[PDB]
Amino acid sequence: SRSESSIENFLCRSACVYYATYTNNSKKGFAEWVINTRQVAQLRRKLELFTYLRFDLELTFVITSAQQPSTASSVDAPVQTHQIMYVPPGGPVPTKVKDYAWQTSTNPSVFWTEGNAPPRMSIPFISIGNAYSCFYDGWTVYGINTLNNMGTLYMRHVNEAGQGPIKSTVRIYFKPKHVKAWVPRPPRLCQYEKQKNVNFSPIGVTTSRTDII
């Protein structure tokens, strides 16, 4: 009951941070997500108690599928294989599904077929500085700080499909590891409005009552 309130027992929890779908034959279906913790409100409030963080990263992908309605005549398909490409900060980025930026040798990718354990991969502390800065009072556009940029993830099918359209949905789970935290900070009171900045609309201090006595 003494160690439940430590830092590693507070932040090393898994959390779903992104959810997207993609079809194979559409020439518009392939996923994309920049790695940041500023999308979901329950993970963002825990990381914003501290100014400087430094943690390893660990991701897990739960990919399913569906059989979208085809025309006719005996749909039978083999197992599907997916590619999950990680783009380090300062790398090439795809614009279509069929592109030369998938095949580059410095963007590490994982391949995985349906029916196995989900594809974990782990990313160390990748930054030029010494800590990720959750709050940055300055310019690079105000309060951006491109020095804590963790990379981008792209997903696509590798199987060419002929008889049936198949859409697939991927959920990404997010887990800090070996967390260090510096310079504590008060917890947020107003609601979050945008992702990039810290803008708000003013709110009362607390819930009110009728009398002081």
Partner: protein
């Protein structure tokens, strides 16, 4: 009492220091020592009854402050520590209470939900930008939302005591002192695109007096850089 530093001399008579650490030193960078360390005194602000607060962004106030401020344009990098002396001089007939906080990396919040505030609203050179007791409406394009109970950061203003602070109570206390180290994620930063400290003064209990006394109380801020060093040739 009567300490001196270069060609500047102030006089004092308890000191709260940083996070328990003292400012210490770190291509090959060299240090300026004789040309810099002196008490740069900003001009005084008047604490009236209808006041709300003030704030100074800290490596912006000393941008035009002479032989330290002329070093800003010749140097691209650097790291600095500070020592702040704040004193308000009232009588034993006035009453009030201040909070003197020093916030590392205090991002401010705009009044429009889509933009970000312009540079002339974040900080003036040796002028105190002042809080407000109302909301700034959303028709304003690039202005800082200066609701004082949120301290411009979207937070509870009572919980600002987690930073290093000092309560100036006019019944018992007269001044404040704060020794702040160099707190940043990189050892040397850009000094024109970063304000890594913010000193706020918020009157929690407002000023009050009887008729006949002076209708104001002046607050004097004195900043002294320590451990000033730069990367250069």
């Amino acid at each position: 009492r009567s300490i001196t530093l270069g060609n500047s001399t102030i006089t004092t008579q308890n000191v709260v220091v940083g996070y328990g650490v003292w400012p210490e030193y770190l291509d090959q960078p060299t240090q300026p020592d004789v040309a810099t360390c002196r008490f740069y005194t900003l001009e005084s602000v008047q604490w009236m009854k209808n006041s709300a607060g003030w704030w100074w962004k800290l490596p912006d106030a000393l941008s035009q402050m002479g032989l330290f401020g002329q070093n800003m344009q010749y140097h691209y990098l650097g790291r600095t520590g500070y020592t702040i002396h704040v004193q308000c001089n009232a009588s034993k007939f006035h009453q009030g209470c201040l909070l003197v906080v020093c916030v590392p990396e205090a991002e401010m919040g705009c009044s429009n939900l889509n933009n970000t505030p312009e540079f002339s609203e974040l900080s003036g050179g040796d002028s105190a930008r002042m809080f407000t007791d109302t909301q700034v409406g959303e028709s304003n394009a690039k202005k800082v939302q200066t609701a004082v109970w949120n301290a411009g950061m979207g937070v509870g203003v009572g919980n600002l005591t987690i930073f290093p602070h000092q309560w100036i109570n006019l019944r018992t206390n007269n001044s404040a002192t704060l020794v702040m180290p160099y707190i940043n994620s990189v050892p040397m930063d850009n000094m024109f695109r970063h304000n890594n400290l913010t000193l706020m003064i918020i009157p929690f209990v407002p000023l009050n007096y009887s008729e006949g006394s002076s209708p104001y109380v002046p607050i004097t801020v004195t900043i002294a850089p320590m451990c000033a060093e730069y990367n250069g040739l």
